Amino acid sequence: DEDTYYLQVRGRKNFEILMELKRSLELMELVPQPLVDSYEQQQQL
Amino acid sequence: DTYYLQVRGRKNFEILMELKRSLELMELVPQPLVDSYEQQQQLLQ
Amino acid sequence: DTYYLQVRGRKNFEILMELKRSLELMELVPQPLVDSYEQQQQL
Amino acid sequence: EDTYYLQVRGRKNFEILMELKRSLELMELVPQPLVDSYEQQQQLLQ
């Protein structure tokens, strides 16, 4: 899903946390697939 | 003190909205219940 | 029920712990204040 | 040493935290120029 959505949040500290999570959720698709596969393996084992 | 962000992906948006709500509602939890929570969490370690 | 999670990285842990608290305490906001909050969000 | 344990009440809360655990852990594996590219792209949105 490539649609973009907007939200607002009250509080600078809350904004900063949500921005970190936004960054992580959006950056995750940039991980090379072989490294994702190696991560998944480590996590179940 | 209101901040605006956008995120790509409906599922990402839905996660951030759940967290926006919980973080904003935190301001309305009576303080002694926040203190009680920290004490209770000492029993879970 | 309660569930366990392991996470690598101290900052990551701090973030998840802050979110955990907010998620676990939101049920303790008095209902009249929740009702007021949701009215404001609809606007 | 650098791994931390957390416990959380509620299945839905657990699932939310697990999804974020995964994204936060995986972000360390993004090649740095793609992080830089992401930050540049983000300038077109806000």
Swiss-Prot record, chain C:
Region feature (Oligomerization): 1-34
Subcellular location: Nucleus; Cytoplasm
Tree of life domain: Eukaryota
Induction: Not induced by DNA damage. Isoforms lacking the transactivation domain block gene induction.
PTM (free text): Phosphorylation by PLK1 and PLK3 inhibits the transcription regulator activity and pro-apoptotic function.
Tissues with expression: Expressed in striatal neurons of patients with Huntington disease (at protein level). Brain, kidney, placenta, colon, heart, liver, spleen, skeletal muscle, prostate, thymus and pancreas. Highly expressed in fetal tissue. Expressed in the respiratory epithelium.
Chain positions covered by the region annotation Interaction with HIPK2: 1-28
Subunit structure: Found in a complex with p53/TP53 and CABLES1. The C-terminal oligomerization domain binds to the ABL1 tyrosine kinase SH3 domain. Interacts with HECW2. Isoform Beta interacts homotypically and with p53/TP53, whereas isoform Alpha does not. Isoform Gamma interacts homotypically and with all p73 isoforms. Isoform Delta interacts with isoform Gamma, isoform Alpha, and homotypically. Isoforms Alpha and Beta interact with HIPK2. Isoform Alpha interacts with RANBP9. Isoform Beta interacts with WWOX. Interacts (via SAM domain) with FBXO45 (via B30.2/SPRY domain).
Written domain comment of the UniProt record: Possesses an acidic transactivation domain, a central DNA binding domain and a C-terminal oligomerization domain that binds to the ABL1 tyrosine kinase SH3 domain.
Other observations noted: Maps to a chromosome region frequently mutated in diverse cell lines of human cancer. Appears not to be frequently mutated in human cancers, in contrast to p53/TP53. Hemizygosity is observed in neuroblastoma and oligodendroglioma.
Function: Participates in the apoptotic response to DNA damage. Isoforms containing the transactivation domain are pro-apoptotic, isoforms lacking the domain are anti-apoptotic and block the function of p53 and transactivating p73 isoforms. May be a tumor suppressor protein. Is an activator of FOXJ1 expression. It is an essential factor for the positive regulation of lung ciliated cell differentiation.
Family note: Belongs to the p53 family.
Disease linkage: Ciliary dyskinesia, primary, 47, and lissencephaly: A form of primary ciliary dyskinesia, a disorder characterized by abnormalities of motile cilia. Respiratory infections leading to chronic inflammation and bronchiectasis are recurrent, due to defects in the respiratory cilia. CILD47 is an autosomal recessive form characterized by onset soon after birth or in early childhood.
Protein name per the record: Tumor protein p73
Entire-sequence positions represented here: 353 to 395 of 636
